TrEMBL record, chain B:
UniProt protein name: KAP NTPase domain-containing protein
Location of this fragment in the whole protein: 115 to 567 of 907
Domain KAP NTPase: start-end pairs: 1-129
Species of origin: Streptococcus suis
Amino acid sequence: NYIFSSQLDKVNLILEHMDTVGGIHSRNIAITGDRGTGKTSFIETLKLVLEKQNYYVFDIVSPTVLSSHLNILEIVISSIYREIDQFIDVHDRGRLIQHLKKVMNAIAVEKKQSDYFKQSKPEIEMLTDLSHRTFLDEEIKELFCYFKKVLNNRQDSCKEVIKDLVLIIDDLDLVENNLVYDLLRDIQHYLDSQLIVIFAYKEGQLEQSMFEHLAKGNEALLNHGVIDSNAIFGQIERFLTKLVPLSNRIPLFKQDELLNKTIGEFLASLDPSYGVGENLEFITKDSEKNKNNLTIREWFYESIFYRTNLKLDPIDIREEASRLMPKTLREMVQLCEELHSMQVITRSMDKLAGVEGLRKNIGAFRRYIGYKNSTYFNLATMEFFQKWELAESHQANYLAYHFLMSYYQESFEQSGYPLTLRTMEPYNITLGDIYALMEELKYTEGISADTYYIVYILKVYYSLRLSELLYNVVLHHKLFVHVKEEATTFYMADKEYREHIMTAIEKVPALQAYLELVNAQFMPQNFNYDRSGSRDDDFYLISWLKDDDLPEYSRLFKSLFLNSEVAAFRYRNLYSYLPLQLTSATFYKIDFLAFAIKADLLMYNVVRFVEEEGDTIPYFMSNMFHIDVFVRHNYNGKFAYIAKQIVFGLWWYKSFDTVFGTKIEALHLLVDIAEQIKISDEQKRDEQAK
Amino acid sequence: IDVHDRGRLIQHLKKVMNAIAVEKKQSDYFKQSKPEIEMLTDLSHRTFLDEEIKELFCYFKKVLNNRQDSCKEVIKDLVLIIDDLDLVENNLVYDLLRDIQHYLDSQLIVIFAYKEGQLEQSMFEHLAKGNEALLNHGVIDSNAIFGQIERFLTKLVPLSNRIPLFKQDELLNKTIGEFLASLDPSYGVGENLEFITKDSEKNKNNLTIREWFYESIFYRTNLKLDPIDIREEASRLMPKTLREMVQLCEELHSMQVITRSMDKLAGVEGLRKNIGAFRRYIGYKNSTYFNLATMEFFQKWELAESHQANYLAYHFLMSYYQESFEQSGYPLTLRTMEPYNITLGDIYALMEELKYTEGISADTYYIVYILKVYYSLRLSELLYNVVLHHKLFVHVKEEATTFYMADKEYREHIMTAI
Amino acid sequence: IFAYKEGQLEQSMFEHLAKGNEALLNHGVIDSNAIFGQIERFLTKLVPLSNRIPLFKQDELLNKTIGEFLASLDPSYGVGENLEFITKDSEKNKNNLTIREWFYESIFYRTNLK
């Protein structure tokens, strides 16, 4: 099941069409696309096909051969001489040698080498040498005719007569630019109607190489406005039309049909037995549980998942994620090589040992992203991402905000609250403002294209760092099992509790770094949870008057929705993801999705995830595309329904899949608390969440 | 000193040398009026250089295998390593890359040992002058050239074959103990941040290089230079590479580290010296992003006597403030102000206002940090020089006691002592 | 032992690398920072910063006393109370004025100008 079969059949059809005409006609072929990589490269395979059809194929002209600085005629005659010297005809060999000498004279004459250009007193007979160059067409024709005759005379048992000589110039995709121009002319002048020349270039390299020469050939025409680029491009157009008829040019395998096919077909192209199993690991025998018909496009994401526990397929397709997957077959093979096992995380065993390898796969994928993300980056974005990496754990948000604002400004000249945080502390940015600014930039009456992919890559980098920090925290789960227990005691029914939480935080630097990344809010602090009109009148503000009058379970309504302790004045944290001690008669703003990122609740969830082995997994804020899903959620007596959505409704949504569990809880302790309510007074989970 | 295979190796070496000469337009083919037929063989040696090189390396491996005694084992492959490519005359490495593409791509195991994106930039330097008229007429952009380079390097070195190691991130994240063990298992840092050898058992080797840097600048300069505001980009000083880390340890190993023993009196004299040494180290580190205004400013600030320095610092910081105003405040109203009317509180106030200005960022923050560090160094140096000459004014202390324990002679005496 | 001044090495390296990086700098692929970092690490490896020794700029030159400099030329040289150069002992000399204000005090006594 050769994968370029159609192209090979078309080549053979072209060769068929031209074989009928034998009157010294111009016939050339131009192969374009990704004809390369491991062992099914179209060029060698085509050469072999031509060999068994009685076409004599010159040894492939590689960039190594072209780097010799010899013209294609010199290469061809050297190959002819070597071929005839390989064996030891007489009658035709001597004529072949005479024509070779004549061609070498013509080459020397063109090089202004002969005595004609170096003698004061020209003689008559050297004028013959000049003729050898002015009649080079006939000499070359006779040379190739006699070469074919000599080759036919070395065939044993009278196999068959050779049809024609074929010259292939491989790996022309990148040969010193102007050099290929020198090649083209050489083919136009000496080997146009002499052989079957196969070019094997890419896209519009020929046109650009011709333009590079003609433009310096047309300075004074272009600057005086006599001609424009259109005239030069038309010249090149008709030249290439005559050199290679557009019915003789064959494209193959760009990115479109590369991404559209199935992973199974590509793996078969490498070997019939290779496949991908249900854990997106590369399999060999049969499995019968394999998933080989997913197409490379979404196989890419489904297989990044199961290795990084990150669903990186964006809800918004404006983000140009397809700029990562493969771009060519070589990149596809190399991606498979980098990404084949990396200790793929499966759905077996006790769902505990897959965390250590997961952060490693995160690092490897970050390296792969950096390799991919090194082309369109110019200077500001390499700089920004580099500084963002080594931004400790808390200056990164400030840098990201100001970088995104730099993008915002680049379209403002041609007020908004998310745009009013430049004279803002690094500890007053959080992650919700980053996402809010990226959305506002996604909806700005300005620049596009590159900006969208910059936003996507920033989201990917943030997700990678968040997952890495979360997994580092999970590795050090023992150090704070106790606080989980305490948290249970603390809001199952003060100040030592906060003290303990801070002590436990200090002993795990990774937990610090994670909580500092998501300072206190991964959702925009503007978000409308009620899609009925505007945002609110006084909906998101509370008072919290005094402890002696707070109702039961009030500690829950301080760490679930109430991530700040301020009146709602310069050097102020304003967020304090730690347990909060609120004063009397003060307005406080509510954020419905703060539970997952509070220190005590996060560590409760971490210990629950590591210790308990059932079927649920606590929700962890490790992916910003989770925020993409969150902003898309409906959320709609009013407060109760929104709270239930936070607790139960939220748990598009395939980005919450996780490699460790089937479903996702929000905070298991809310279940136990619900139990106590039953004492004081899917259906069961719904009723408790209510 | 084989015979059977050496002669073939020599023949292939001669063929390769011919091919090289032919590529150099050296042979008689390019210098003779009247070409002969057999020199066309020499051209072939260059048009078939791949096969000649393959045979050469095959026979070289055979000859090397024939010199093994006691039949140890057969050689697997030939490996070529090109070290210290991080900085080789730019375009020269391009000439190397092509040479590897043309002659040694599928012949050996080539190890490149370069840094970051040096290869891409070196290729671009050549392709850009190769694509003048394409770029200026708008036919192509940098993206096309970068894609060309991208796929070329993808084929030359598969991205599964490239290995990075030890940038600054994991360099700063590890512990000082691990690095010192990387130098020698017995080296460590004691509780006074001095380098120890035996065991101590009071050592602090798990502090990480990041804050070990500051904790060890302290105990030598008596200066806590870790900034409360992390916007200030102090991490631009600590190390940047392992070589810089080793050299920092070399410069900063004892410098008569000030301990918590004895009578806390003799550590002042060495403290100002360590201040000077650290100022030198800062100047060495702080010589890259500085362009012309800041070298100038800091130089003048040094030799600003002892009182024009504040004026210079204020006007330099105001220069930074202005560079973002076009795109009233009281701290900004001191340019037509005497040098003796600036003080140090206005310098700090202006640096804070610049830290909170709706304008430029990045470099400005680190400039503020370095100015603060320089001021702290000068203040500590002057304070310690004063402390050295403490006897000369013991009497005034006593007088001060008498003076506000309960006039005009008192002021007179204070001025004389000053 | 190199015996150069200030940042001559960095500037000399930049003069070469900049013409080595025309098309990188004009197309915005790199800035002066990259070239300066290259030079920085090259010079860091060539001469460790623990191996470089500075001496006697203008700061400590102006801070010392005229007597110390004159002793650096010859132990007996000094400056008298009229700011004239003396040799024997005077015992009325003023050698501890520092070069900074000795400069002005000695322009005075010759031009009658403070």
